[PDB]
Design a protein around this nucleic acid. Sequence first.
RNA 1: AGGGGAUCGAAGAUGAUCAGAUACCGUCGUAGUCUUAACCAUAAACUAUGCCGACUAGGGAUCGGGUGGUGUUUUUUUAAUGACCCACUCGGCACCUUACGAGAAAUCAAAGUCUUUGGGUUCUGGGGGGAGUAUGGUCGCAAGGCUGAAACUUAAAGGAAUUG
Lengths: 87, 25, 97, 121, 206, 56, 96, 129, 216
Amino acid sequence: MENDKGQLVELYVPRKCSATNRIIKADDHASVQINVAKVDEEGRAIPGEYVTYALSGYVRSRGESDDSLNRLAQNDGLLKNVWSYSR
Amino acid sequence: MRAKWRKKRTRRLKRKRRKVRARSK
Amino acid sequence: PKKRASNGRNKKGRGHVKPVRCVNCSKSIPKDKAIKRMAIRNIVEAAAVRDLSEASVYPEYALPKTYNKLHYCVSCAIHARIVRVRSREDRKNRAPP
Amino acid sequence: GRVRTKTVKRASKALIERYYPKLTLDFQTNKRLCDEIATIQSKRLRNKIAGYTTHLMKRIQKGPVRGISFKLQEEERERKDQYVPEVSALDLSRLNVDNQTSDLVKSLGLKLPLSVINVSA
Amino acid sequence: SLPATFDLTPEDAQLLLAANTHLGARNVQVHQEPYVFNARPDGVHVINVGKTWEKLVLAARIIAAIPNPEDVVAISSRTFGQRAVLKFAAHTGATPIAGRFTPGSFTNYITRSFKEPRLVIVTDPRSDAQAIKEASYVNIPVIALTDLDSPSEFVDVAIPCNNRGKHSIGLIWYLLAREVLRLRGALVDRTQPWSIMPDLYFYRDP
Amino acid sequence: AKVHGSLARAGKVKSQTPKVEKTEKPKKPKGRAYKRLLYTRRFVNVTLVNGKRRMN
Amino acid sequence: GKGKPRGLNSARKLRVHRRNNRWAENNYKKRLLGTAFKSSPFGGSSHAKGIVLEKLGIESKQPNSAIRKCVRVQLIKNGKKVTAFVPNDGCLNFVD
Amino acid sequence: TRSSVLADALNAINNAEKTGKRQVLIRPSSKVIIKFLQVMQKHGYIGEFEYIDDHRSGKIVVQLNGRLNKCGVISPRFNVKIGDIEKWTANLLPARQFGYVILTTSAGIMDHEEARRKHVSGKILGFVY
Amino acid sequence: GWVPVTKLGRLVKAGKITTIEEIFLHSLPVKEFQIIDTLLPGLQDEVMNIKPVQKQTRAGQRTRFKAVVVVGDSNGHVGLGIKTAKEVAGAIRAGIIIAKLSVIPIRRGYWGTNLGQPHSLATKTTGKCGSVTVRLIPAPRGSGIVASPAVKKLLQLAGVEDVYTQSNGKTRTLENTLKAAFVAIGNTYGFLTPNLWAEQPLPVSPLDIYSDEASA
RNA sequence: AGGGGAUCGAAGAUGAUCAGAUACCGUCGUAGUCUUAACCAUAAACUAUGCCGACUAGGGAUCGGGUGGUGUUUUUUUAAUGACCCACUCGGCACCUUACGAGAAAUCAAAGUCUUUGGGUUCUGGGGGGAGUAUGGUCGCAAGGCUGAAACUUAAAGGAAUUG
């Protein structure tokens, strides 16, 4: 957020769960940031360029983080039809 | 001690206050 | 405070159980709350099968057994080297030994 | 009983932690060199320490011993973990998938040689 | 996305099918596992070995993303996976943990076994509940060889396979060690059969 | 409870105490000036710092 | 639904129900009943005058050992006998 | 028995949103639910909802994002005057910068801050934030 | 010396992480108290009370002193630590370490019509510990901190200056109130607000960008 | 108030035990215990958890009904059936694990969706004693039931857990 004009305030703009779209607090020690690399036409990973996935601790606690990341990976295309919208 | 016997004791005294009072009315 | 979920017994949906009498002191106890143990022993005994069979006509006919079902109250059952006491965690266990 | 204590077992373990390219499996050899590597106050104790470590050496050389991780052992990482069992384990995949696994292969699309036979009951 | 070469090759199919990785857990079915495919009669559920491949490849991509190879820790307490994680430690950084976990390894740095990994891979999540419980204390992703009935609580990307077979557990670690050696460029040829026998990651009874 | 007792000891300690008279001292400023006296002694002077800033 | 009615036309039920549970309060019941007027030997006033009748040596409740030096005073406006404490160190000599 | 339909609709959303689910099935889909949802949708609180038409009363399938903290219904529908709106907003909103009290007025259903612009008030239905 | 043994300790000592924001943004767990004061050299401590707890033993009792310590600079950060020890002085020293390890950011907002230098809380955040619930309400400029002296000391040490409070339950137990208020000022960043609906690029943790200086 | 009245058995009588024992223990033993007609209106009448409605995690078992399966078994190998096996579903008595959730805790799939406080509704409580007492009503043949204080007295009673 910002005050009347310019000079952004609200230090520490936080991250968000990529599965439930909720703020990951500083004390959320169950949350992870899934870190997957890609390949370029050869099948060899390129260091320094990554695809990120932030999952809150709550989703992992339910054990549903596996399912939530299955659909998150498909929408980026880096995964295949393992996930289906309709159960 | 026992609340069962304080209920019983009071009931036996309810009889007395009810019987001694009948001597008047 | 509550000590057990069933609280002594197996009464969920009856309201009344038509009690039976204990076998050691003859105390009234509801049938579900009773501690029924079955005693099925041989008529003579485990180690006496020779002397009966040794002097038995109708050789080794049946050697039959006695069947009866015993009901105790909680006071009599505990005093009789039975289900006596379990720790708070082990009280939840329902499987027989 | 002759059960040793923690002040004897821990010291013997500590000696083996760092002195494997060192003292051998004979007590007289272990006892004589244990006097100068370790400053043990009492003779009766360095006999106890040397006796237990000699007993230990009779166990590391025959199979690994858990809880003993010295400067080398992790190293056998190339004789006793590779070299697939004895003389066997040269061919372990040579077909026998059941009737239910059959349609899984065609569902995936790839053509795999499958001598599928209906599962007898 | 993918160069379309990562798709399941015919030669790897019978390897998965011979190792019985398709036949998973019995009628017991955790609702978190839609990986099942047309459950076989006689109370057997056949995992889609197809869907296993993408997760196995996806897990390999995550492993290769870790800059320092020693920050990956392979956890296996089950008796069928000590050798598999040991070879996995030889061919990659992959500091292994086989046997007892020494609970508290992810906390109380005064411990002699203090580990601070960036990613942990567990063989049996049920038998490694302590291993993954402490991961959730210190912000660590977890990869599991999840069955169709495993306790997927606190478990990130998980490869659906069979954990009741000696070969199935051993082979998956062999596969999981293959693409991480291909994405990293250790194996020059992507289509190379890698004739190094898969029997290396197999438990021996004597 | 019992109502009797002994009234003969009423004011026993009030009489036994010795009589000591007000020690004469110069009179203290009253009003605004006392605010100066309090201000300087406890916010400028740190003399009564015995162990815990003990003023007495 | 948490007990109490919540309907928009249920003010009478809420208004009446408060009154019946007002009597549970010690202060409200005492004030409406007017016990101070009909009891509490004052007339509900802060102070009252009386005549000292005797002097008392009332004991002290445990744990305590003292003589409390009270007096028996009879109020003028009511004529009731009450016990009054003489609070100071040895001022019973002034209440002869 | 079922007294307020809007309460159940707003209750199902909260339980679904609390547990992270991105959708919820609403029954039996009265009009005021449709109008109430359009107020939440206008501010980006819900997103997409689709009215399933079975011949009895209808159902709603709402798509939920993590953008909703709590949505409520105020029972009973207290009469709210123009001066009394501010008291409601202070009691049941987390701040003065966000959140809307949704109240039904004579000129349709509308939230509190935009009802001030029209300078009209009425009965209170609920809130969203 | 410090000679840290942890991932964050060597990163901080090397100066690779310059602000405590990176620790909070990535929710990096902290295990050493030399990190907190290195990043925040201007945080001050305040011990609240020392109450001796007793345990029945073979000989009467034995006494240990449960110290409560609130730390944190008056700008945006605060940490609460409770620790017991055999001696009074030692409990505070260990109480300092525990309080530093728990330092968390607080969300300062505006009551209305944002003017500059946020003074009050952004939302109404509650906290609970035991039976004590502590609620915080935003207040206009110049209202001060309407709170009990113990809660006010924790609140003003967190940076907030204008806020209302409504406690509930048995507030005379200090630890439950101080712990309840800590959760109340910790939930401030957990409230998703329209100001925080924008998407973010999900920045990379320093553990991987600067992985070259690990322990090995 | 009639009938029945075998067992057990308030009362009572006895033998013990005991310092005492009109109690526990043993033997008798009336009223009662059973029934018909009529009163009583109470219980730890307890799940100490009001009723109706919606929603929130999994799992197997079981009871009743229903649906499907070239399924098993028996009739006349055969069928319809009956009993079983598998899968699904409605309703029910329950149970197991876990805690996003609640609680002071014990614990709770409700005792959850309650300071981010509002689905509908009925009843009840306001520190502990006095006291469910006194009095007045009303019901009852009676025993008693329902309603129900005040004076006075007190700083604690009480709940759940921890170590001894």
